[PDB]
């Protein structure tokens, strides 16, 4: 069940825990696990978690190495724990969940998700593993992903992308789009209509629609005229205003990506975790414009246009609710004289 | 006055300390501050200072987030402490000064700079803050920056650039060029004529004059002929000599920047701090030429040309003094038969 | 013999230990050595070794700063210890050897390699240092490098590249190709014929033959036809197969380098050390193809072609032995119907 | 205004957390909490727990400073968590329980014991606190102590002693004997009839009956004759046999106390925690007799005599179950020819 | 040739820093200093301070090993720093002062006390060291101790006891009673008339007057009658009241010493530092009586009797100021009907 030296043997020989027999010599110093290779010590793992170093080492070695839902999705769906696996949170360099089921003797609260202690918890089930669909059917609270149809259950089509060893990708050699199912108190839920964030990053941003291609290629005024965006404050919200000491707008990742290719800037990720909305302390290196809390979301530009064009613009300020990544994201909408002033998501 | 959980609340909600009421749960493990977000721990701060972790966390959260003088300037002007702010040293990942005034109960030596304990110390005053010009007028020892004129005081025009959240920049949406004033023992000082370093970096180096543009674009022999630099050893001092085991010359940042675009090399910053002169252990990857102590300064090329063309070349070796960043920098000048052999700054 | 403050003085003033007299104030906190510079603490060294922080600091300061053999070569030749120097292992951020000879009072097992305790150990001798060739002649077990001929000893021509301050390079201003000699139990050995790995890296990979230039420039099918590689599974072994969930082949660095310029991927170096064969956990970001243990070797493409074209292809699977970096590397060769299926090195 | 600096203010000014307003400067280094007193740092708390230093500091400051059941009693009753207090485990220098209810934002799983997350946990309730008897009635799983009767509930009289700030004592100025009640799955459970251990220690051991006074003062042969203990191997079980390399017997604390006054020995407490039965690696300094696992229990000698005399001595070896401190303690009984060879508890 | 390895050489060979030449190999791990002795590591120093381990090691090695004033005296006199020595605080296992003068490159603010940076600090000067009386005369702020008269300066006779390597003692082979002098803002300051605490401890408490001998040997009623202490609540203040849940009185160390010989109790020193008044969280093991903040002072019983008998007993409650160890100690006096209820010092 447990053996630090056997975990290290699997890491050295298989790249992760693979259930192989064997042992290697291990040193633990502070928060770092070493193994002896021909007379000298080689670092295997640096603990960045709040768990004991040897426990975090084992959970990391036993991480799920298939494509799995991004942590923000599991969090938004209320997942508390995973059935017989570890979802490793690469944004936090730590397990996504505090406890485990049938993984590690120090963190297990149960060997199987059918045990009583798991009933009030929302357990994550993976239909790609034999028997887990049936475990979901019998579980009181849970979230299930599948690659195909489940008899008698209507699916919710999830995002196109998933996380594979910390790399978020849309799979071509592997399936990353899952069907989602959720049960609460033994009742199968109808998951709401939702947008999905695109989980792209600033430096290798790639467009996923013709509008996004046009946004990156065309000048600001050409793009706004082509897609008839006059009065929606896209100059402020998406392109960003760098003329004053406080940086204006800049709430869509594609706008940051366009600026970054032209002029670099600093993004301080002061709450480093996976979430649908991200807050950054941004400092523009060219102008000196800055903002302590700049909320950023990566929506497909077409989706963001649909959202802002579907709002009433008759009051000065109000909260707009948008279902994104299965959760209700609050946006602040500021208007003046029937046109938009700004529109930004809130991290909550 | 003091509350670790309130500091963390401000960091999470405002990106820095903003004087807001509230608390979040905090964990301190070794030298890392965490906060609990929906059942899991998220890292807020890793202490790299020699201060206690919770104290360094508070000083970092209370850092000045306006454009401020670079630490090398404050050090050269003899600044010991700041009035009611924290100058964060991003080169050292630590406070620029050991003690504080009216910032933190663990590090404060006073609540106000008018207290007796501050009289012998050179206190930094910021004229952009209400009342600090008057505090400078009454202070015994101090350095004051302003954006405009001060009645009855002659200013010293400082560098064009300043530091904003660790980004050194010439402000366009914000003012980064300050007037400087200094008092010693109650007497307003005449600050000397000085050159200023340009605070650029190796990889995104940008020219700031036509001579620098020509240096980057033209070949070595074309540039030297155009600006009539024969006999000043620019081939050695600025371009660098990579033909022997010991790397020759290479003491101006623009010369390193030109080499780096053509051929990468290793720069070991073995004294990592902000200073007018920097010493690097350099290893050229293409040739294997190396040098344990390679002194580098980032002067505007036009300024460096003026300096070296203003020296007497009649002795084999001597020390040349140049006022740079308000301090007296010693250069070694080596000559032979009336022409320069080398010319380099000394870190002292 | 020993002085922590004197080691730090040499680091600050000379960039490494240089035998100079002097002292600076030092702070040791956890695993970090600091020195006080004008009232504030500056980090000099962060200990990443399993040694005490002050001991590792001294060994790092006393590292060899000339071109030295890469650690993988010394390990393959059985080197246990170095004569009167420290070979710093930049892959491990630690000394390459556990003990020293005449370097450090905490780690020395002897002052001179002629002492009895060194006789059973394979001592590394550097012919560029006065007297070390003669010490090798009198030593029982040892490895010697020279830049030129040694009277009465036949040399083995080593690799073209060597390590200079952690930068692996083929020297142009300095000599990096050494003659190698080895003695075991007082008997000079005949070192075997061997290939050498090229020690290049993924991102600045440079071809070293016309075949490698053609591999990077031509399309897959053009290159295979030009060099008549039909039936040798180069599409699988070198170019890689990204069509299935398990990534196929990709065992030569030049193939990874070609893929990386076109499409980025993740390489997890889960045994971070210097070795002739490297194992990576690879995840392709474009396709999602991945493999937990992907063995990679950087052979000159011409050498790899010679190796695979010199094998018998008549059995389904067998182990092939290839002398590389002076050690016997085991390759697995898989064949079907007289053609290659795959061919990969094993890390052992 | 809950804060690290406010916790430290209460410790400095009140000796523990007392809900007072105020702050003092705090430094956290080396898993230790310091406060600044006239320019220099004074240590307030060294963390010996597996919790973060600032969290353990707060739980320690918020420890219950009234007499509370010993941790071994709470463990034997299956207590998982306490309602709105912290039971500090002075044998482990750590909280007795991992989580809290309405104590600390970092460790709370709930603010009140009525929340659903507490239902499957056995919550400790203190009838001396207003409202906690009613919370016990509504809790699905729990343990309740009171100083008096609770209408309708059948009580179990607990041990005479309790723990006050880490001092186990029989209260004279305070009450330390409580009624006990327990609920499992929403149903009140009958607590078993039980002996209680005496919770004494080697150095300041004091007899609590005439038989224990006789054992300490009389010689071995005289005591066994007076209390008619022939055939029960008291020479082995209680007095101990130091004649062989392996130390024989010595399973009652009073026997260790008698030996210790005569000749010192080493007791390695290799599982340092509060428990009804303790295991020690014992080395006798005079003879060199030793034993890696010597199980020791502190029963009133009268109780142990009552237990062993009630045994059937016709079997070579059998396991005997005795309820002690509300838990079932297994004893190994070795006999030969109708007399006892040895009789020892198991951990 | 000042160095970490040279400090360790002096510790190993001389027991402290003695200015000798030499070096030994040193390892620094776990906030601890080791040296290699015949192949294995031997611990020389465990850092308990908030300074870096190698810095604290040097300051400890350079500690003053002559009799020096107790830290509570230096604190009460406002001492900020010492001239060319280290006063080691054995109650905190740390330097008594943050910075140094001419001791250690990492902590020095100056090489000599005459430097301008020292002028606003109260520097401790030791007249037993050549030149330090003259440095006191030139210092703007300072405290001076001497073994004899200084011409022109009016002395204050200090306590009989001093601290030698952490042992507080009244010297017989060495002098421990010093003259004291103090300067503020360049002006010599008259030190007040003062009592001194006796600096005794619970275990090895020894009486130092016939009244203290009587207190330990006589019964409570007999002692109060002989010394005519009726109406002064000595039963409460000194002997302590253990009859209620809250422990009453017990504010003089001699009263704790008398109780401790009779029955043990726990004293939690939750602010562990040297101070004229100490606060303890006390738990009586026999009765269970306890008190979170019990202020205790070790005055000669004759001095305490002199203090309390000089009091006006006509007010329900008032604060009484008494100069002790050169500082103003506030006492709370509670009276009723012309007799004392309680009388305790405040920290
Ligand atoms: O009258 C107001 C007040 C605030 N804001 C907007 O509210 C946000 C927080 O102050 C800012 O939006 P931004 O971050 O996109 O620039 C600001 O412009 C308005 O638009 N109008
Ligand atoms: O006769 C001498 C001795 C030294 N140097 C120069 O002094 C510096 C330190 O040795 C080197 O300058 P560099 O770093 O720019 O190459 C060296 O060339 C001379 O020019 N001439
Ligand atoms: O019948 C078999 C079994 C295994 N392999 C090969 O053996 C290796 C480990 O399974 C893989 O080679 P690769 O890493 O280059 O893809 C696999 O294709 C074969 O070629 N044929
Ligand atoms: O046949 C047996 C086997 C074991 N034991 C007893 O079982 C215990 C563990 O081996 C020992 O009892 P002690 O610790 O009190 O000396 C041993 O004497 C017997 O008495 N008889
Ligand atoms: O009316 C009052 C209020 C307080 N106290 C006393 O003040 C102290 C703190 O409450 C206690 O004194 P003790 O610690 O010596 O017992 C208490 O009895 C009185 O005597 N009378
Ligand atoms: Na339970
Ligand atoms: Na003072």
Numbering used by the authors:
A (entry chain A), B (entry chain A), C (entry chain A): 0 to 347
D (entry chain B), E (entry chain B): 0 to 346
What does the paper say about this structure?
Surprisingly, the uracil base is anchored by Trp333 in the guanine site observed in the Nsp15/5′GpU complex, confirming that this site can accommodate purine and pyrimidine bases. The 3′-phosphoryl group occupies the phosphate ion site created by His235, His250, and Thr341, as observed in Nsp15/5′GpU. It is surprising that uracil does not go into its dedicated site, but the result demonstrates higher affinity for the base in the Trp333 site than in uracil-recognition site, potentially governed by the strong stacking interactions with the aromatic side chain that take precedence over hydrogen bonds observed in the uracil binding of 5′UMP. The identity of the Trp333-interacting base is irrelevant, especially given that the enzyme’s substrate is most likely a larger RNA molecule. The position of phosphate ion or 3′-phosphoryl group of 3′UMP is also preserved. Then, the available Trp333 base binding site can accept base on the 3′ end of the uridine moiety, somewhat resembling our Nsp15/3′UMP structure.
The Nsp15 enzyme is active as a 234 kDa hexamer consisting of three dimers. It was reported that NendoU cleaves both single- and double-stranded RNA at uridine sites producing 2′,3′-cyclic phosphodiester and 5′-hydroxyl termini. To evade host pattern recognition receptor MDA5 responsible for activating the host defenses, the Nsp15 cleaves the 5′-polyuridine tracts in (-) sense viral RNAs, which are the product of polyA-templated RNA synthesis. In addition to biochemical data, we report five new structures of the enzyme in complex with 5′UMP, 3′UMP, 5′GpU, uridine 2′3′-vanadate (UV)—a transition state analog, and Tipiracil—a uracil derivative.
